[PDB]
Amino acid sequence: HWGYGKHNGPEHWHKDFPIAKGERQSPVDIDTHTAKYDPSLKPLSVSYDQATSLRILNNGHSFQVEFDDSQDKAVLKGGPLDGTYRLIQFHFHWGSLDGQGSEHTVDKKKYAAELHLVHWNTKYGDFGKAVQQPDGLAVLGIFLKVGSAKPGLQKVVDVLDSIKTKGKSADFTNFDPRGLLPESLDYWTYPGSLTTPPLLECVTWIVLKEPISVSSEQVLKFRKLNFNGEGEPEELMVDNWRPAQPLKNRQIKASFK
Numbered sequence: 001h002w003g004y005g006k007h008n009g010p011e012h013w014h015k016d017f018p019i020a021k022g023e024r025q026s027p028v029d030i031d032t033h034t035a036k037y038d039p040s041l042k043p044l045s046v047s048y049d050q051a052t053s054l055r056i057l058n059n060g061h062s063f064q065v066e067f068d069d070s071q072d073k074a075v076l077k078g079g080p081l082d083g084t085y086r087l088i089q090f091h092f093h094w095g096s097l098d099g100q101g102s103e104h105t106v107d108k109k110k111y112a113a114e115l116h117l118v119h120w121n122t123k124y125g126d127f128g129k130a131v132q133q134p135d136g137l138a139v140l141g142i143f144l145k146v147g148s149a150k151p152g153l154q155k156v157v158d159v160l161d162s163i164k165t166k167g168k169s170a171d172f173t174n175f176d177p178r179g180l181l182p183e184s185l186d187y188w189t190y191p192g193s194l195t196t197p198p199l200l201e202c203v204t205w206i207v208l209k210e211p212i213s214v215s216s217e218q219v220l221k222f223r224k225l226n227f228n229g230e231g232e233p234e235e236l237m238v239d240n241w242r243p244a245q246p247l248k249n250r251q252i253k254a255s256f257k
């Protein structure tokens with residue numbers, strides 16, 4: 001029954017999911033001055049040329065674009081990662097206003113939205129086993145700011161009216177997630193968690209420094225989605241972000257000087 005409202009939002013999650021108050025929770029504020037450049041970080045490799053999207057789904061908390069992960073296609077490796085991680089889905093978090101919506105913050109700055117490209121460590125065979133491991137997932141996080149439109153996002157925006165409500169899905173093939181990436185792959189990285197229940201501490205976070213720009217019209221369409229199912233009172237899907245959590249005993253590393 002978790003969600004993002006007053007009675008079931010982030011401050012309530014710890015009752016059903018005690019790990020909410022754990023030692024490696026996400027998101028976090030990225031203090032850019034305290035993050036240390038790490039020249040030990042191997043180069044970061046995003047190989048999406050063969051990515052094959054299947055479907056887009058309103059899951060009641062966000063919308064997600066799913067990929068066929070049954071073959072070695074669409075892999076993230078290098079950077080802080082050992083081994084190879086396979087793309088399974090992407091989704092977003094966003095606000096009711098352009099001044100909020102991101103989960104991670106940068107020197108307390110909130111972006112209008114945040115994209116999560118979720119990948120699982122192939123050493124664990126599939127996603128459900130990977131999330132039970134401390135190094136099971138790698139999530140590539142990309143900030144969105146409102147400005148120029150992102151042409152590569154438009155195909156996603158245009159299908160949203162077909163999945164307005166919780167539980168609706170639509171075929172969504174041939175979508176190329178390379179169109180959602182900024183020019184630079186400079187990043188911050190730290191060990192953390194899923195940002196929604198069950199809040200499992202299984203994620204290596206890789207957060208790109210360079211945001212992508214999307215237009216006001218594009219994010220406005222995100223905000224027309226509904227948290228509710230069809231035939232239920234309309235509740236706009238907005239502010240589906242968890243706030244920053246305590247850093248505790250963790251160091252954020254930068255790939256750049």
Ligand SMILES: CCc1cc2c(cc1OS(N)(=O)=O)CC[C@@H]1[C@@H]2CC[C@]2(C)[C@@H](O)CC[C@@H]12
Pocket residue numbers: 059060061062064116118139193194195196
């Ligand atoms: C693993 C990253 C992941 C996946 C999902 C969410 C959150 C997630 O963590 S995060 N934000 O990348 O750190 C929130 C909604 C989830 C979704 C995938 C699985 C679902 C559970 C759907 O079945 C229904 C709700 C969906």
Ligand SMILES: [Zn+2]
Pocket residue numbers: 091092093116195
């Ligand atoms: Zn997410």
